[PDB]
Amino acid sequence: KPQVTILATGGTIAGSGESAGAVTVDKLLAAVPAINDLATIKGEQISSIGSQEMTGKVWLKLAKRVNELLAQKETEAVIITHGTDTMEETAFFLNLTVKSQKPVVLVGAMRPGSSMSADGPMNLYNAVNVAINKASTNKGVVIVMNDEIHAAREATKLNTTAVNAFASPNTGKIGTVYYGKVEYFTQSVRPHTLASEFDISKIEELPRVDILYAHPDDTDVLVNAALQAGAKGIIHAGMGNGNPFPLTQNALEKAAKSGVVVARSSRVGSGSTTQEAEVDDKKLGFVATESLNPQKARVLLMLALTKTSDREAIQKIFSTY
């Protein structure tokens, strides 16, 4: 039987009303007993928060612990139970810091376990089947939600409330899991996990990266406050294909000239924030984030800034990962 550790970052995603190693994981196994037949489950309570309270300190603790567990010959896979709000940021961060080909599966629930028609039991059961599947090896970190397997690079929460809120808008799901039957149809061709250049093993604090939301009649004062608070990087969630308002652009130009990395993304939801469009990135000293979203671009810029603030090197990073 495969040995799998469930790391809980918060409360139970499945069941309600109630020795693996963490009381939350004991309550999951009691609520979804079918998972005991699939894997020998150990549990740990890695953090004790809602995903809207996530911090870089928790991301570092989680990455280091996932790396320690998957370095163990006895451990086949890790499943992380996670709040849906920021699951895509944690998954993306682990996709570039986990140094293993063994499966890492993040899973959550859009409805509380106490709800009518709670999604957590099926999502967790499916997650365990994905974690133990031979084809999950070397797929990178995945999100399993609503019978779908999403590449961490591509995944996002695209809806506030729907059980089907997770999407991969620039690709689509890489696979399906239906009552535990796992089938992959595609795999990412963007480097992840072992192929990532990033190493957070010695890092205690990630670089500060702010995100700004672009609109008509925009401002310089939020760029200025990010600079004053010691931002190392700024993601600009631009209008359309990463376009700033002029007052904001002038402040971003000043930020870039001071050595703060300015990375253009978009508020729109999907598509690439492309190079050689309307913004003169080379003159103004900006990076184009291409086919990500602001919150995942922030994670990649945080990781980039652990070893470079050079525009050309960071553009290569955005054009590679």
Q: Is 173 in the site for a copy of itself (CB under 8 A)?
A: yes
- 281 touches a copy of itself (CB under 8 A): no
Nearer to a copy of itself by C-beta: 21 or 185?
185
Which one of 83, 103, 233, 285 is in contact with a copy of itself (CB under 8 A)?
Answer: 83
Distance of alpha carbon 227 from alpha carbon 256, whole angstroms: 10
**Binders in 207-266 for a copy of itself, by CB under 8 A:** 210-217, 219, 221-222, 224-226, 228-229, 235, 237-246, 266
Site string for a copy of itself, 45-74 (x = CB under 8 A): -----xxxxxxx--x---------------
d(CA 236, CA 226): 12
> Per the annotation, does 84 bind a ligand?
yes
**Amino acid identity, residue 165?**
A
Give per-residue burial for 13-49: e unless 16+ CB within 10 Å, then b: bbbeeeebebebbbbbbebbeebeebbebbbbbbbee
The one catalytic residue in 5, 12, 97, 273 is 12
Q: For residue 65, count other CB atoms closer than 10 A to its CB.
A: 16
Would you state the structure tokens that stand for residue 30, as one six-digit string?
Answer: 């009691």
Report the alpha-carbon distance of residue 117 to residue 165 in Å, rounded: 16
- Residue 152, amino acid: A
Q: Which part of the chain contacts a copy of itself (CB under 8 A), choosing from 2-10, 19-27, 112-120, 306-314?
A: 112-120
Structure token digits, residue 192: 């992840």
Q: CB-wise, 132 or 237, nearer to a copy of itself?
A: 237
Strands 175-178 and 77-81: unpaired
178 contributes a contact to a copy of itself by CB under 8 A:
yes
Is 85 annotated as ligand-binding?
Answer: yes
Q: Is 193 a catalytic residue?
A: no
Stretch binding a copy of itself (CB under 8 A), from 40-48, 74-82, 163-171, 194-202: 163-171
Residue with tokens 């040995």: 3
Residues marked active site are found at 12
